[PDB]
Amino acid sequence: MDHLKHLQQLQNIERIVLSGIVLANHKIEEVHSVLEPSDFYYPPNGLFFEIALKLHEEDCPIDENFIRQKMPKDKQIKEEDLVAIFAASPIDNIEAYVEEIKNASIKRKLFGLANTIREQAH
Amino acid sequence: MDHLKHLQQLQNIERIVLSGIVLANHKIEEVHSVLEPSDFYYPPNGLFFEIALKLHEEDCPIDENFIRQKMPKDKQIKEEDLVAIFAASPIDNIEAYVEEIKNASIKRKLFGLANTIREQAHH
Amino acid sequence: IKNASIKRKLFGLANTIREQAL
Amino acid sequence: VEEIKNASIKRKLFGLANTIREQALE
């Protein structure tokens, strides 16, 4: 895999984890013990997870209906990003995927910090 | 400085700058404070700067994946021009380069206006 | 050094959390 | 002593970051 295929696969993987939460709401818990919305590569994936956490906290089912209805307002999720999540194929055992999303996240934070540092050094 | 070499240098400098932005997506604010897409010598680099500016306004990462996803698909950036940008070495402090890119843009605008003045005079 | 230190420290923590995870 | 440590570290971070980038392409 070249770098491009990896980024494309991180995006795909996020969709699959989120799709699985829609099909099995209770997993939001095991996934959240590792991920925050901030850990998502594709921002709309983060806002989706952020809406789902909020729904779960109040015991409202996590589905297409409620994700849209309670969707922020000032911030929205594009139609295609929504469809692309709902349409992803749910797999069993997303432990690996969740781990790859977290790993990729730490890598990005390291990169941001690496930049900022060599930036303050002028 | 050979004229050919110079031109090749301008093209090479634009990539290194764009490659630098891909390494630190935040550097796009600084670069944009001096450069518009139309200020790039090699058009595909300006087009790239354009898609990047758009991706940053949506807080979407500027990387190989999204650059290709956000490409107009009516108009496209030939793969060789992409690998050119992504493979170039991010430098430390692309300041001078940015001002160099801006300077050659101004020169070309100078030359263009020079021609319209000459042409529109020889009625 | 000020914010950078806090960013390196919190980054270091998000790191060891992945191991403390169990 | 002093900021000698804040060079071994940063350089440590820069080496890891560079390692991850080199391991992503070319």
Numbering used by the authors:
A (entry chain A): 1 to 122
B (entry chain B): 1 to 123
C (entry chain C): 101 to 122
D (entry chain D): 98 to 123
Source paper text:
The HpDnaB belongs to family 4 that consists of homohexameric replicative helicases. Each monomer consists of a N-terminal domain linked via a flexible linker to the C-terminal domain. Replicative helicases bind DnaG primase to synchronize DNA unwinding with RNA primer synthesis during the process of replication. To understand the roles played by NTD in helicase function, the importance of the linker region and helicase primase interactions, we present here the structure of NTD of HpDnaB at 2.2 Å resolution and compare it with other NTD structures.
We determined the structure of NTD of HpDnaB which is highly helical with a compact head (N-globe) and a long helix (H7) at the C-terminal end. The asymmetric unit consists of two complete monomers and two short peptide fragments. Interestingly, the two complete monomers form a dimer which is stabilized by the two short peptides and it eventually appears as a heterotetramer. In a dimer, the two monomers are arranged in a head-to-head manner where the C-terminal helices are extended parallel to each other. The two short peptides form helices, which are arranged in an anti-parallel fashion with the extended C-terminal helices (H7) resulting to the formation of a four helix bundle. The electron density suggested that these peptide sequences are similar to helix 7 and MALDI (Matrix-Assisted Laser Desorption/Ionization) analysis of crystals confirmed that these are degraded peptides of helix 7 from NTD itself. The dimeric interface consists of 29 hydrophobic residues that bury 3410.56 Å2 of solvent accessible surface area. The head-to-head dimer organization as seen in NTD of HpDnaB is different from other homologous structures known so far. However, the NTD of HpDnaB construct has a half of the helix hairpin (Helix 7) which does not allow the formation of four helix bundle as seen in the structure of MtbDnaB. Surprisingly, we observed that the NTD of HpDnaB shows very weak binding to HpDnaG primase compared to NTDL and HpDnaB, suggesting that N-terminal domain needs to be in a proper conformation for interaction with HpDnaG primase.
